[PDB]
Amino acid sequence: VQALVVDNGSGNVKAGVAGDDAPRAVFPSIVGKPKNPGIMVGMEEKDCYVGDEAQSKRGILTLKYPIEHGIVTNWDDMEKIWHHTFYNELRVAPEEHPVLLTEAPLNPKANRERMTQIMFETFNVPAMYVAIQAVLSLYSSGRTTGIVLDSGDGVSHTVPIYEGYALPHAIMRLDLAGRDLTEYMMKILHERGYGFTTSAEKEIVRDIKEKLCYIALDFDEEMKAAEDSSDIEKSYELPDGNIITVGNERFRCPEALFQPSFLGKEAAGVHRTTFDSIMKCDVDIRKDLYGNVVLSGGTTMYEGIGERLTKELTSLAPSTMKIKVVAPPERKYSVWIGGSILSSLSTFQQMWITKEEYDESGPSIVH
Amino acid sequence: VQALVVDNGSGNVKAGVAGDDAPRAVFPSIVGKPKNPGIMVGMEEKDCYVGDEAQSKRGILTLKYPIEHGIVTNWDDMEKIWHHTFYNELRVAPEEHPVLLTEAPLNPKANRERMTQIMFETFNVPAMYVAIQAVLSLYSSGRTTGIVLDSGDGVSHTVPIYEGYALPHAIMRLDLAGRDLTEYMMKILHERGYGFTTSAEKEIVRDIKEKLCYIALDFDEEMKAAEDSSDIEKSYELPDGNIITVGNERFRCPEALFQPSFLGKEAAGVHRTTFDSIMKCDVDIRKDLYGNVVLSGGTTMYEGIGERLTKELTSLAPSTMKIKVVAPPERKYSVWIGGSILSSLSTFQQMWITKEEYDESGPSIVH
Amino acid sequence: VQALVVDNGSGNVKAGVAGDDAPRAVFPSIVGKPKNPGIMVGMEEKDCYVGDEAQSKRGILTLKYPIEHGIVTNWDDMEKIWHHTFYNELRVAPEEHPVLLTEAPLNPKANRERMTQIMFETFNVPAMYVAIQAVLSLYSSGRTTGIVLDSGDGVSHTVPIYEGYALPHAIMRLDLAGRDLTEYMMKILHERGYGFTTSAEKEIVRDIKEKLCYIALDFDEEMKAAEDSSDIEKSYELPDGNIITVGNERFRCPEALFQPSFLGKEAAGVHRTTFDSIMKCDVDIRKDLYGNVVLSGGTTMYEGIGERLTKELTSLAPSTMKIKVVAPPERKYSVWIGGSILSSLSTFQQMWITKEEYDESGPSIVH
Ligand SMILES: C/C1=C\[C@H](C)C[C@H](C)OC(=O)C[C@H](c2ccc(O)cc2)NC(=O)[C@@H](Cc2c(Br)[nH]c3ccccc23)N(C)C(=O)[C@H](C)NC(=O)[C@@H](C)C1
Ligand SMILES: C/C1=C\[C@H](C)C[C@H](C)OC(=O)C[C@H](c2ccc(O)cc2)NC(=O)[C@@H](Cc2c(Br)[nH]c3ccccc23)N(C)C(=O)[C@H](C)NC(=O)[C@@H](C)C1
Ligand SMILES: C/C1=C\[C@H](C)C[C@H](C)OC(=O)C[C@H](c2ccc(O)cc2)NC(=O)[C@@H](Cc2c(Br)[nH]c3ccccc23)N(C)C(=O)[C@H](C)NC(=O)[C@@H](C)C1
Ligand SMILES: Nc1ncnc2c1ncn2[C@@H]1O[C@H](COP(=O)(O)OP(=O)(O)O)[C@@H](O)[C@H]1O
Ligand SMILES: Nc1ncnc2c1ncn2[C@@H]1O[C@H](COP(=O)(O)OP(=O)(O)O)[C@@H](O)[C@H]1O
Ligand SMILES: Nc1ncnc2c1ncn2[C@@H]1O[C@H](COP(=O)(O)OP(=O)(O)O)[C@@H](O)[C@H]1O
Ligand SMILES: [Mg+2]
Ligand SMILES: [Mg+2]
Ligand SMILES: [Mg+2]
């Protein structure tokens, strides 16, 4: 009997069995419902268009994300997503193995309580545990000291840890992630006459962003250079065979991470958030936090993010410090691998919240 | 079988085996307890953060001194400190060798009685002896006549001795030591905008004081000179890489030894205390006491203390006398070396207080 | 010709003319700058959005406090605030009347020197004086003996005074005030799903705190009672008409004054700080200090603070003492009224620092 590890993000669902090196089932976290009447008699009108099945036939479906900034907004569809994960992707009986789940820090308590109640009463798991994503990202890297910058589709958070002890008063959360960048890309592609509006057009723009975008080392000089020559342009082919050309948007779209004012948000960039999280720690801790910054999440996968973040932090921190940003090649799956490591430890076997405790202490047993 | 010599101060613990020329184990006398919850499963949550181990990871610990003005205020942590000394630093079995301890003069009797009871019942030593620090400082210097000014972290005392005979009615005690100077430095560094509050920040200010401070030959002229030029300033680098600059505080901080009114204390300086201890002696003794003043303790390590004390005593004593202050290079370890000399004498073998006497005569056997 | 009294705090500016019973102009100490481009031609783009004008249209402005823990961090905006006070609120010529200012104890000297230079060179006042807030709070109460606990938006300090003589070595300063409580309220409102991030959202949370919070007599029993019934809940209406409900946060937020560990700060509560300030005084003074404790500042306006502080001090002080906490109804304006009383005394006319002295003795004339 091995635990199941299900990392539940705003954009993707990563599921698998503890002990594996990689998640065996990764599919987008969408639920689709048809927007047209079915006319041919003799077909099967499936209700659960979940994940890649909904992605494949998004032409006749309207797509909805049940998780928004890490908070579940539609529990009915989230239950469908969980059922899909347990029965069609992993193809296991959930009542046999305990399940390890993840949740972003500084989340409302009702979210976790509803999650626990749904797991214990609908799917009937023997036990569970809910862990923070940022501490698992540190488990994946085999280290006990460092500050983790996790950025996914819903929310970015920084969690500093020193010698295994957490520093909860220094945790920062920034609701600026990949979905905001996709929407900004949709907005600024209108400058060239490309109009994207539909839910499927959103998934097209997301695919454009994931391939053509990169982070410039400095923004103003790169702007001035781009206005002079056309070698920055690139071409992308739409599903129907139409060809579009993208220019300085390639480095304009991800710049909003460091300048949120591009999105109309009154906030500070990821570099400034990292620096301010470090500065809330004790003076003796700061050197080891500067010396080890961990990148996690898919949003940190832009080419050149490490150099840019190192330059910003070096410009902010005193000249004596040696800023070292750690960007593993597999940092898109750091949280899942960390959870896989955590669930297999012999020490962790006492933290399982069995159903007998839940029925004894109510939903608040998780806290 | 050789005796163990443990000099137990308010700030540091000096331990070793009799016959050595120097203490083999010197570590600060602090006990730390974590102030944060441990979040990573798979680490060891040690309870005894004692000495340099607590000093190394003071960022996540709160630090407490179990001895205050030479009187033990927390016996539970003092027992931890003694266990650490016996088992992790010296790495000996305490039940094999007798232990020689030290205690400041004019201390309450309950302190010594509790110390003896803890040693005999918890650690089970074959024998012990408790000696005054000031007479051991005279043993270290190979002399029988002179007045000893011992100043450590908790309390300053002067003990005059003539031809081996003590003069107990002339003993003076002044509760003004290194810890008071560290707190005064913390207070007056706020004039420049440097705020130090935490327990670890106290250890940072102590390190600043131990390197940048010195004693001016005269205070008012040095003030007037410092206000004219900036060559007195010096720079110090904080743990995180920030740089601070200190000015006249360098000679303002140790001036409180000679002017306790800087600390708000209604008392007299160390020079005046020394003079008044001398004047309580017989007229025939005073010449040999003026001719030999012994400096002991770490607080007397400021550059220029000898010249200042000689000037003060010369201004107080009659012009015929030749004041001679003795400042050995190793006066930071005078008490321990004196105890090492004392415990190795063949004459001293009769003063051991064995356990059989203790069980016969109660805790009062020490007196 | 009557003096002007300007009490300059971290959160609010209280200004007026000496001889009045109350400050005629009280407005928040904020400077706002627009974060949007102006599109309508024919409007006036004012630069100085200061005080209530910035508060009224905070939707399109970003708000910044130029004073942080009683130390001015942005002199350019502080000059704007002072100009606003002198010309739009009081509507007087500053070069006609002398100005009396206030400053928190244990402040860096450069702050006061820059303040004096700005007043004498930009606004050209005939004279000035800078006074400590805590001694003015004692003037307002018509008393010469007592210990004053002043707590505002930036810093809390306790200053004991006996028979008119100050005891500067017993002064304590605690950087924990109303702004920290507002930030803690923002943090712990996330438990219910309420997210407040913007500068204007900070002013919304401050208004929530000022009305719904109170201090429980004991914390654990009140917790246990709150978990049983919902009668502790209350509702608050947001600017746009949305309704939020607050529960045990009402007495959780101000508890951080007595348990700073809630904020992640390694410090002691206000009761412990008061007790430790008393214990640094002479034994003969302590009875009259216990018998008269003065509350000053807006942070001490929570319902039930007097009973809680009396209970804590009674539990700390010996059973013989009768702890009496004095909480005037108008203690939010104690410092200003005390300054108004002080400036009108005939004795005080010799302490004015005229411009002729300043030009003669440099900025250090204030000290
Ligand atoms: C971009 C795509 C196809 C493209 C036709 C592929 C080719 C390659 O692009 C062009 O030919 C550029 C051309 C264009 C028109 C004028 C111009 O000075 C420059 C370019 N653009 C147009 O005609 C606009 C007009 C428009 C509609 Br209506 N609303 C909008 C909202 C904002 C902006 C513009 C518009 N147009 C018909 C569209 O966007 C349509 C709706 N877009 C799509 O179906 C997406 C899924 C794929
Ligand atoms: C001194 C240190 C770092 C420093 C930042 C290193 C640099 C080099 O110093 C400066 O930049 C000087 C600057 C300053 C500010 C205003 C001014 O007219 C002159 C100097 N001082 C400040 O901003 C004060 C403000 C302050 C707090 Br809040 N409470 C206090 C209590 C008393 C006095 C002042 C304050 N400040 C943020 C601190 O002290 C912080 C808490 N101190 C530390 O973390 C320690 C461990 C190390
Ligand atoms: C509190 C306010 C309005 C409210 C909407 C008024 C109504 C009355 O509250 C609700 O309906 C509660 C609901 C909620 C959602 C899930 C849940 O299990 C319980 C409650 N909360 C939400 O949807 C969160 C989601 C969220 C964002 Br995004 N980041 C966050 C950071 C931390 C926590 C949560 C979040 N949400 C949209 C907000 O906070 C927005 C940004 N808040 C505001 O604009 C402020 C100025 C006023
Ligand atoms: N190679 C890539 N380059 C840039 N962005 C990417 C890349 N791969 C994924 N992303 C972005 O990462 C976001 C979500 O990634 P992920 O870390 O899985 O988030 P979640 O934690 O919500 O599952 C997507 O919105 C996508 O835009
Ligand atoms: N080189 C130095 N210069 C100035 N002060 C020092 C120096 N070394 C140590 N001290 C001070 O001496 C104090 C304690 O020294 P020590 O004599 O070991 O005291 P104790 O008898 O309590 O062990 C410390 O508080 C430290 O501030
Ligand atoms: N009625 C009230 N109840 C609770 N807190 C209050 C009340 N009125 C004001 N405050 C708090 O007092 C703080 C500042 O008050 P004040 O004493 O004017 O400070 P300052 O000295 O900085 O002007 C504000 O941050 C506010 O949160
Ligand atoms: Mg994720
Ligand atoms: Mg000593
Ligand atoms: Mg005030």
XYZ file of C-alpha atoms in Angstrom, chain C residues 106-305:
200
model
C 15.225 57.869 22.400
C 15.082 59.247 18.852
C 18.157 59.791 16.653
C 19.628 63.283 16.789
C 19.624 63.839 13.019
C 15.815 63.734 12.997
C 15.520 66.669 15.404
C 18.340 68.585 13.719
C 16.752 68.244 10.266
C 13.398 69.291 11.734
C 14.941 72.425 13.251
C 16.784 73.301 10.040
C 13.642 72.883 7.915
C 11.628 75.060 10.290
C 14.229 77.827 10.516
C 15.242 78.001 6.835
C 12.108 77.123 4.848
C 9.279 78.477 7.004
C 11.353 81.066 8.925
C 9.795 80.853 12.409
C 10.931 83.367 15.069
C 11.606 80.624 17.627
C 10.865 77.026 18.533
C 11.100 74.344 21.197
C 10.990 70.553 20.960
C 9.418 68.696 23.880
C 8.927 65.059 24.837
C 5.381 63.778 24.403
C 5.327 61.843 27.680
C 6.058 64.851 29.901
C 3.336 66.843 28.140
C 0.869 64.035 28.806
C 1.644 64.603 32.499
C 1.092 68.356 32.136
C -2.374 67.685 30.726
C -3.346 65.725 33.854
C -2.227 68.409 36.314
C 0.160 66.129 38.202
C 3.877 65.858 38.949
C 4.308 62.184 39.919
C 3.376 59.183 37.811
C 4.378 56.894 34.971
C 3.000 57.624 31.502
C 2.229 54.908 28.948
C 1.961 56.649 25.570
C 0.939 54.514 22.597
C 0.177 55.956 19.177
C 0.562 54.817 15.578
C 4.339 54.436 15.480
C 5.903 53.691 18.868
C 4.976 53.028 22.493
C 7.108 54.457 25.297
C 6.898 54.636 29.090
C 8.451 57.562 30.965
C 8.398 57.646 34.796
C 8.510 61.034 36.547
C 8.713 61.646 40.295
C 8.166 65.068 41.900
C 8.951 66.786 38.609
C 12.351 65.126 38.215
C 12.754 62.776 35.273
C 14.409 59.362 35.603
C 15.973 58.966 32.144
C 17.654 55.644 32.857
C 14.242 54.028 33.420
C 12.739 55.013 30.059
C 11.562 52.119 27.894
C 10.600 52.150 24.226
C 8.574 49.491 22.408
C 8.122 49.680 18.626
C 4.659 48.126 18.633
C 1.739 50.451 17.991
C -1.488 50.891 16.044
C 0.011 50.353 12.591
C 1.299 46.917 13.611
C -2.166 46.035 14.906
C -3.733 47.164 11.623
C -1.316 44.972 9.674
C -2.034 42.015 11.974
C -5.764 42.561 11.434
C -5.183 42.548 7.677
C -3.240 39.297 7.995
C -5.780 37.453 10.153
C -8.828 38.601 8.196
C -7.594 36.268 5.436
C -8.768 33.334 7.562
C -12.347 34.205 6.575
C -11.592 34.920 2.915
C -11.360 38.721 3.125
C -8.365 39.965 1.160
C -7.067 43.481 1.811
C -3.929 44.558 -0.029
C -4.068 48.113 -1.362
C -3.197 51.310 0.501
C -6.870 52.322 0.568
C -7.773 48.830 1.757
C -5.380 49.492 4.643
C -7.432 52.564 5.584
C -10.574 50.419 5.368
C -9.104 47.826 7.744
C -8.027 50.611 10.104
C -11.624 51.834 10.245
C -12.850 48.286 10.898
C -10.362 47.948 13.759
C -11.258 51.287 15.339
C -14.896 50.260 15.753
C -15.216 46.495 16.166
C -12.237 45.646 18.378
C -12.034 45.379 22.163
C -9.731 43.921 24.813
C -10.883 40.805 26.642
C -10.311 40.598 30.392
C -8.720 37.163 29.937
C -7.871 35.644 26.583
C -8.201 31.866 26.872
C -11.610 31.800 28.566
C -12.892 34.362 26.066
C -11.594 32.168 23.233
C -13.365 29.121 24.644
C -16.582 31.110 25.047
C -16.388 32.545 21.519
C -15.998 29.083 20.004
C -19.327 28.066 21.581
C -21.745 30.819 20.521
C -22.126 33.238 17.614
C -23.255 36.261 19.657
C -19.719 37.677 19.414
C -20.045 38.164 15.647
C -20.717 41.600 14.176
C -21.268 42.993 10.687
C -19.502 45.831 8.885
C -20.475 47.456 5.584
C -17.773 48.140 2.996
C -17.648 51.321 0.875
C -19.286 49.583 -2.107
C -22.103 48.055 -0.063
C -20.675 44.593 0.576
C -21.172 43.201 4.089
C -18.505 41.291 6.027
C -18.755 39.511 9.377
C -16.022 39.467 12.029
C -15.824 37.014 14.910
C -13.097 36.339 17.467
C -10.753 38.580 15.472
C -12.356 41.424 17.432
C -10.465 40.499 20.603
C -7.637 38.662 18.825
C -6.285 41.790 17.106
C -5.555 43.977 20.186
C -4.231 41.001 22.170
C -0.883 41.487 20.418
C -0.181 44.430 22.732
C 0.045 41.985 25.643
C 1.417 39.069 23.565
C 3.768 40.482 20.907
C 4.637 36.914 19.874
C 1.425 37.035 17.834
C 3.268 39.457 15.530
C 6.438 37.367 15.456
C 8.243 39.933 17.619
C 10.591 38.828 20.410
C 9.493 41.364 23.006
C 7.372 41.813 26.123
C 3.869 43.205 26.470
C 2.944 46.726 27.485
C 2.168 45.556 31.028
C 5.588 43.921 31.341
C 7.289 46.982 29.845
C 5.485 49.194 32.372
C 6.487 46.902 35.239
C 10.122 46.777 34.118
C 10.245 50.563 33.786
C 8.920 50.844 37.346
C 11.449 48.315 38.643
C 14.355 50.360 37.270
C 13.448 53.165 39.696
C 14.490 53.632 43.307
C 12.645 51.630 45.948
C 11.143 54.735 47.562
C 9.672 55.921 44.250
C 7.848 52.732 43.298
C 4.779 53.152 45.512
C 3.800 56.500 43.988
C 4.446 55.149 40.487
C 2.176 52.155 41.103
C -0.467 54.470 42.513
C -0.666 56.588 39.332
C -0.389 55.126 35.826
C -1.408 57.483 33.015
C -2.747 56.262 29.680
C -2.066 58.427 26.634
C -2.436 58.016 22.894
C -5.125 56.651 20.624
C -4.018 53.020 20.851
C -5.085 52.970 24.523
C -8.691 53.675 23.486
C -9.817 50.039 23.226
C -12.713 49.197 25.506
C -11.491 47.313 28.554
C -7.797 48.227 28.418
